[PDB]
Amino acid sequence: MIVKTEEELQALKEIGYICAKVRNTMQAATKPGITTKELDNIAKELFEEYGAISAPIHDENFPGQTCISVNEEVAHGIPSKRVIREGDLVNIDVSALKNGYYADTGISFVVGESDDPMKQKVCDVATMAFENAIAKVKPGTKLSNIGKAVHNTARQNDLKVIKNLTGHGVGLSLHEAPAHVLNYFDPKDKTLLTEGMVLAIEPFISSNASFVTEGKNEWAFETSDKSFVAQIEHTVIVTKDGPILTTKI
Ligand SMILES: CSCC[C@H](N)C(O)(O)c1nccs1
Ligand SMILES: [Co+2]
Ligand SMILES: [Co+2]
Ligand SMILES: [Co+2]
């Protein structure tokens, strides 16, 4: 959406806070021996407490408050009896609405220690990619400069991006214009950011695969080669004074 009023801004900051709070709490609770359903239950309880509702359930009838994706799963993982183990690469993606306004945020992290430092590496580089992407964000700038930054960051670190996952406009719905914020540069795209524009920016950084495929069920996205992939996602408002992240605390 385009923010035009204080009251819209306040609504967006409110639901952004809630999603960040849920995301942080779930991440903190993630340890060997907990199931992803147990983690999802944390979101259930905090969403209720803060008067928000799950965006995956509301907008998509997703079977879970949040999306929790582990190891082979990159995105859209269904919380379940799956138990977290030492070394797991976990993505927790939290999106929700309150009073008609939305936020969307996500983080990948390593549980304890993996035997393969690449899991942390893709996490490190996803964080860098996000930072580099938003350095480029102001009214009038090319949407495609976001993907350019993300892919450049990947390349600088001998990594790849997931080309067929994207960011999106967000605000009055989970997904609205601009339809796709790419993780790479499209020379032909003349779409610009504007004052007040709200975007979910979510770089996916991969150790090998450049795309995801259908996974173990109707929802999960995976890589067949079991690449390690990390996401960082925030909801961002484009302003003259710089980006405002509603989902950063
Ligand atoms: C299945 S509803 C969850 C969508 C997710 N919040 C998202 O928009 O961040 C992603 N888009 C692509 C991958 S994760
Ligand atoms: Co998300
Ligand atoms: Co998203
Ligand atoms: Co999406």
From Swiss-Prot:
EC number: 3.4.11.18
CDD domains: MetAP1
Keyword field: Aminopeptidase, Hydrolase, Metal-binding, Protease
Binding site for a divalent metal cation 2: D104, H168, E202, E233
UniProt keyword Secreted present: no
Details of cofactor binding: Binds 2 divalent metal cations per subunit. Has a high-affinity and a low affinity metal-binding site. The true nature of the physiological cofactor is under debate. The enzyme is active with cobalt, zinc, manganese or divalent iron ions. Most likely, methionine aminopeptidases function as mononuclear Fe(2+)-metalloproteases under physiological conditions, and the catalytically relevant metal-binding site has been assigned to the histidine-containing high-affinity site.
Transmembrane segments: none
GO MF, one example: metalloaminopeptidase activity
Keyword Protease among record annotations: yes
Domain of life: Bacteria
Gene Ontology annotations of biological process type: proteolysis
Binding site for a divalent metal cation 1: D93, D104, E233
A Pfam family recorded for this sequence: Peptidase_M24
Subunit structure: Monomer.
Family indicated by similarity: Belongs to the peptidase M24A family. Methionine aminopeptidase type 1 subfamily.
Function field: Removes the N-terminal methionine from nascent proteins. The N-terminal methionine is often cleaved when the second residue in the primary sequence is small and uncharged (Met-Ala-, Cys, Gly, Pro, Ser, Thr, or Val). Requires deformylation of the N(alpha)-formylated initiator methionine before it can be hydrolyzed.
Protein name: Methionine aminopeptidase
Organism the protein comes from: Staphylococcus aureus (strain Mu3 / ATCC 700698)
